Amino acid sequence: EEKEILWNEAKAFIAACYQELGKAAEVKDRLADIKSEIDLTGSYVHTKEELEHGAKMAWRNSNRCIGRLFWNSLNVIDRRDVRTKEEVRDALFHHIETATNNGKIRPTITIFPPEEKGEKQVEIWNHQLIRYAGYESDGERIGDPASCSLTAACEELGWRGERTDFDLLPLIFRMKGDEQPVWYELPRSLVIEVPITHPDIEAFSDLELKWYGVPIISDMKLEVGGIHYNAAPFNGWYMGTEIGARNLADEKRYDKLKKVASVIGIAADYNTDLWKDQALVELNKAVLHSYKKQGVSIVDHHTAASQFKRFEEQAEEAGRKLTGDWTWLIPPISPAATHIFHRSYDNSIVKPNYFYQDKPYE
Amino acid sequence: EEKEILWNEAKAFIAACYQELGKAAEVKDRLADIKSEIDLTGSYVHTKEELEHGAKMAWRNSNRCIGRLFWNSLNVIDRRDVRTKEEVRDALFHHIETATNNGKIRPTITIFPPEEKGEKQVEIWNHQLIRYAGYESDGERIGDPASCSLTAACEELGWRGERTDFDLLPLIFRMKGDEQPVWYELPRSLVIEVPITHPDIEAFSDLELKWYGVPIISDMKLEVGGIHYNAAPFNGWYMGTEIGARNLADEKRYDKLKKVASVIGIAADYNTDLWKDQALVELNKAVLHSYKKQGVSIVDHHTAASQFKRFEEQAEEAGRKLTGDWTWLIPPISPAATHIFHRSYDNSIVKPNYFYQDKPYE
Numbered sequence: 264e265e266k267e268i269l270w271n272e273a274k275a276f277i278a279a280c281y282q283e284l285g286k287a288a289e290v291k292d293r294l295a296d297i298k299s300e301i302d303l304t305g306s307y308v309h310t311k312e313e314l315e316h317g318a319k320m321a322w323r324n325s326n327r328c329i330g331r332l333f334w335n336s337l338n339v340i341d342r343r344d345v346r347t348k349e350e351v352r353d354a355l356f357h358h359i360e361t362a363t364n365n366g367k368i369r370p371t372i373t374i375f376p377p378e379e380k381g382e383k384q385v386e387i388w389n390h391q392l393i394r395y396a397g398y399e400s401d402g403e404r405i406g407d408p409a410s411c412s413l414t415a416a417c418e419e420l421g422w423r424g425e426r427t428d429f430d431l432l433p434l435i436f437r438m439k440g441d442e443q444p445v446w447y448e449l450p451r452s453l454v455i456e457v458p459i460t461h462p463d464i465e466a467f468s469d470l471e472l473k474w475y476g477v478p479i480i481s482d483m484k485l486e487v488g489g490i491h492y493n494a495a496p497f498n499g500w501y502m503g504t505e506i507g508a509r510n511l512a513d514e515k516r517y518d519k520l521k522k523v524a525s526v527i528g529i530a531a532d533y534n535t536d537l538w539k540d541q542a543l544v545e546l547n548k549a550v551l552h553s554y555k556k557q558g559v560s561i562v563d564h565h566t567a568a569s570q571f572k573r574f575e576e577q578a579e580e581a582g583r584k585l586t587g588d589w590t591w592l593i594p595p596i597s598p599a600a601t602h603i604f605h606r607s608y609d610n611s612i613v614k615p616n617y618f619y620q621d622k623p624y625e
Numbered sequence: 626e627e628k629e630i631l632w633n634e635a636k637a638f639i640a641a642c643y644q645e646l647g648k649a650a651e652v653k654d655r656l657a658d659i660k661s662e663i664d665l666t667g668s669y670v671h672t673k674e675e676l677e678h679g680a681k682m683a684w685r686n687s688n689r690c691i692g693r694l695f696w697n698s699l700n701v702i703d704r705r706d707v708r709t710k711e712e713v714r715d716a717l718f719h720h721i722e723t724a725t726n727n728g729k730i731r732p733t734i735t736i737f738p739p740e741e742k743g744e745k746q747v748e749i750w751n752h753q754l755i756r757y758a759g760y761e762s763d764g765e766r767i768g769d770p771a772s773c774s775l776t777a778a779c780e781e782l783g784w785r786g787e788r789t790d791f792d793l794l795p796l797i798f799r800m801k802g803d804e805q806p807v808w809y810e811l812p813r814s815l816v817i818e819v820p821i822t823h824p825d826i827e828a829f830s831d832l833e834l835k836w837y838g839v840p841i842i843s844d845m846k847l848e849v850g851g852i853h854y855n856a857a858p859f860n861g862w863y864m865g866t867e868i869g870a871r872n873l874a875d876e877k878r879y880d881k882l883k884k885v886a887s888v889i890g891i892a893a894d895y896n897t898d899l900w901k902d903q904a905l906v907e908l909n910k911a912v913l914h915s916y917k918k919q920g921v922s923i924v925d926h927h928t929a930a931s932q933f934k935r936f937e938e939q940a941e942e943a944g945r946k947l948t949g950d951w952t953w954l955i956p957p958i959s960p961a962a963t964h965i966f967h968r969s970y971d972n973s974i975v976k977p978n979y980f981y982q983d984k985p986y987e
């Protein structure tokens with residue numbers, strides 16, 4: 264059954280990919296080649312052009328992403344050649360450096376060797392390549408609660424965090440044939456961080472908030488033409504609400520809204536005062552101001568929705584069906600101020616795409 | 626087929642209703658009675674207890690409503706006895722007065738005779754019993770754009786609006802056997818309105834905004850045990866975001882965010898300033914303040930979500946499945962600050978319920 268699934272996905276992908284690349288004439292011969300390869304080897308190998316366009320198609324098909332207007336300019340780094348943990352480490356360090364680009368963030372994906380018999384060659388444990396640790400011991404909570412289980416796993420392996428609220432987790436990944444993952448500290452010179460200040464409220468710096476510049480999701484599987492690239496970290500730039508309305512605001516994350524209310528000088532006592540809403544707006548204004556001031560790329564949710572409208576228009580013009588997940592596309596503040604809130608979206612899954620996979624810790 | 630549909634819905638409703646009322650022993654005989662009645666007459670008549678509990682069940686099953694905690698205290702007014710347009714008019718005037726209750730709003734539904742052969746006895750044209758007119762003539766826009774088509778229909782019938790931004794539409798409805806609906810001006814003494822002021826910003830009154838106290842949806846069909854009450858207006862009290870984040874803010878409604886920004890003293894020039902979000906928060910604070918100051922019932926979205934959490938807990942305790950429409954339950958500002966945003970809901974349709982029906986204008 265597996266080989267049939269592979270061949271079927273292969274036929275569909277190659278036809279679509281080559282059509283988009285104006286290479287429809289080459290489909291017949293390429294498919295012939297692929298079927299023999301599947302017959303002999305049990306799998307097939309993407310050309311560099313196929314791999315690049317496939318990763319771009321996968322972003323374009325990501326129903327939950329508002330940032331898809333720019334799918335065709337994804338920078339694809341082919342690291343199917345890696346075989347050692349030092350090569351994986353150095354590739355991940357390089358992704359950080361080239362994606363960061365001194366603050367002018369470049370959307371980038373680095374693609375490692377794919378699974379073979381469903382057998383992973385490289386298994387990355389990090390959820391993002393840059394993320395803060397989290398701790399919870401006898402009532403005491405430190406750092407990012409979303410990272411508690413991964414943090415505990417790292418400390419089982421001999422890492423020790425300083426227990427600030429912003430400890431950088433090490434890179435952690437496992438190679439085929441190794442029983443345990445290895446870990447490596449991130450060099451601080453690779454990691455840009457932004458202190459959060461407010462354009463008008465001087466006291467906002469008293470909160471001592473900061474966040475990292477680049478979100479690099481490293482635990483999803485890229486699927487292209489039936490080939491499963493379980494290790495393929497990718498990044499864009501942040502939409503400010505991810506940081507201001509979720510990472511810093513959620514009660515199960517940094518939970519800062521009461522502290523924000525106090526520094527902006529409003530009471531946090533009555534629901535009818537809408538103090539949480541006001542605090543959210545000022546925190547989100549501070550996040551955008553601070554990234555801009557430091558020259559680190561970021562987009563606000565209004566501009567992002569406007570870009571997404573153009574993505575919808577471009578899909579229609581190209582004669583492609585648009586898919587989307589309304590529940591993720593609407594921003595978590597002022598959603599009805601965006602056009603997204605007022606229309607609906609087909610949430611069908613189209614491949615190539617990025618998928619969740621089981622965590623090897625937990 | 627129709628009689629079979631009726632009988633099937635009847636069996637299901639009576640069983641469930643009588644179970645809830647501790648009257649399970651009476652189900653057998655009541656069903657026997659109903660089947661004979663259906664046989665002889667083509668339909669059946671609800672007892673007052675059935676009609677009341679059915680309307681309450683219908684609210685409880687309304688997937689789009691965050692306010693359902695209070696379903697069991699709905700005030701049900703049985704007006705199946707009406708036969709003339711004066712009786713309908715006076716019943717609608719009475720609903721307004723008793724629901725308004727001098728500002729201490731009482732959730733209320735008035736139920737008129739049901740359809741017979743799918744033949745309506747009373748057809749209400751208003752979307753809400755109290756709503757503002759809207760006009761659009763050679764580039765000039767006045768009032769509530771959502772009411773333009775109904776306003777034009779009323780003016781075809783000899784009504785004329787003053788063309789302020791807040792003209793009250795007349796009641797308009799049609800009786801079985803009449804070709805045209807009749808209309809009646811609302812007595813102003815029946816209609817409470819609230820001027821919008823801000824608790825701290827004196828200039829906010831310069832916008833000269835106001836809204837009516839009581840939302841009374843009058844164009845949905847109540848379906849109970851297979852009987853179709855197409856005329857059954859109902860009301861609760863407002864959640865403040867309905868007024869502040871939608872009616873007064875939507876670009877296709879009163880579109881006031883730029884004016885709000887100016888009176889609160891912020892620029893409306895850069896998306897990254899989040900001026901729309903800030904204006905939304907201040908407008909919504911003003912709406913809640915103004916209703917409270919005037920002693921007109923209203924709920925903020927935080928308190929409403931908290932009540933809805935209790936509704937979920939109560940459903941579980943009673944052993945009833947919970948249904949809901951996540952896309953409507955989340956509030957249009959700060960949705961991720963409510964528990965609703967972080968869970969999912971089964972959007973299955975359960976009857977009794979309230980349904981949309983075709984408009985007789987348009």
Ligand code: HEM
Nearest residue numbers: 322325327328329330370371497498499500501502562617
């Ligand atoms: C260029 C700037 C980008 C912006 C502003 C952007 C924006 C976003 C936002 C706001 C989310 C929701 C995240 C959350 O709530 O957890 C998201 C999800 C997503 N984005 Fe993008 N994105 C960008 C680039 C990319 C790139 C380059 C890719 C892949 C090549 C990508 C793939 C996705 C995927 C797969 C998700 C869903 C993640 C999940 O299900 O947890 N995005 N995006």
Ligand code: HEM
Nearest residue numbers: 684687689690691692732733859860861862863864924979
């Ligand atoms: C007691 C106070 C109540 C509050 C605070 C409340 C809150 C709300 C809100 C905020 C909406 C969304 C409205 C929109 O965006 O257009 C809604 C929808 C709804 N509510 Fe309630 N509600 C209440 C009472 C009632 C009552 C008494 C009923 C019926 C007996 C009812 C039935 C519904 C229905 C059917 C909808 C959906 C309307 C549609 O699909 O357009 N509600 N409710």
Ligand SMILES: CNCCN(C)c1cncc(CCc2cc(C)cc(N)n2)c1
Nearest residue numbers: 478480497498499500501502505509510
């Ligand atoms: C789970 N969603 C809430 C927490 N959150 C905002 C979050 C969690 N985990 C990962 C991300 C990053 C998502 C992402 C990916 C890319 C490529 C870009 C971008 N702007 N955001 C965000």
Ligand SMILES: CNCCN(C)c1cncc(CCc2cc(C)cc(N)n2)c1
Nearest residue numbers: 840842859860861862863864867871872
């Ligand atoms: C269509 N939704 C956006 C416009 N809007 C907020 C709206 C439109 N049409 C009708 C209503 C009233 C909905 C309603 C009904 C009841 C019983 C209560 C309540 N608080 N709101 C609201």
Ligand SMILES: C[C@H](O)[C@H](O)[C@H]1CNc2nc(N)[nH]c(=O)c2N1
Nearest residue numbers: 603604605606607952953954955
């Ligand atoms: C297209 C989308 O479903 C539509 O805009 C809905 C979304 N959620 C909503 N939620 C509420 N409460 N009221 C609405 O009018 C809407 N509009």
Ligand SMILES: C[C@H](O)[C@H](O)[C@H]1CNc2nc(N)[nH]c(=O)c2N1
Nearest residue numbers: 590591592593965966967968969
């Ligand atoms: C349960 C619900 O689907 C869940 O909270 C989703 C809703 N929408 C979201 N949208 C985005 N962009 N990110 C999220 O984490 C979530 N959470």
Ligand SMILES: [Cl-]
Nearest residue numbers: 478505506510
């Ligand atoms: Cl993040």
Ligand SMILES: [Cl-]
Nearest residue numbers: 840867868872
């Ligand atoms: Cl309304």
